[PDB]
Amino acid sequence: LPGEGTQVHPRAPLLQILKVAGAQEEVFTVKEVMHYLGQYIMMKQLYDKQRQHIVHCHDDPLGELLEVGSFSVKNPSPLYEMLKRNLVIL
């Protein structure tokens, strides 16, 4: 994924999720995209209530993009692979 200063444009399915999280922009840095994804998971309460580094996304639009039913915030590979598929580098 691109560096800190590099700007990206999220593909429609991802942009839609960032919009739910309150994103107004169309062009982001990777860190900004990550901020809104965290907001989204928090708002929809997709994290496991007891072990909160686990996210359950199996029946959510985010799970469709990630292509997994759950992931660990400490094993973020699925997230970065999703971003590679869904971010246009500007």
């Binding site: 994924l1 990777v30 860190k31 990550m34 901020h35 965290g38 998971i41 928090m42 994290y47 909160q52 580094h53 996210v55 915030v73 400490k74 973020p76 970065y80």
Partner: peptide, 14 residues
């Protein structure tokens, strides 16, 4: 930790 705290760590890394 809380999810907020875990994600904040992840955000700071990326």
């Amino acid at each position: 930790l809380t999810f907020x705290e875990y994600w904040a760590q992840x955000l700071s890394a990326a």
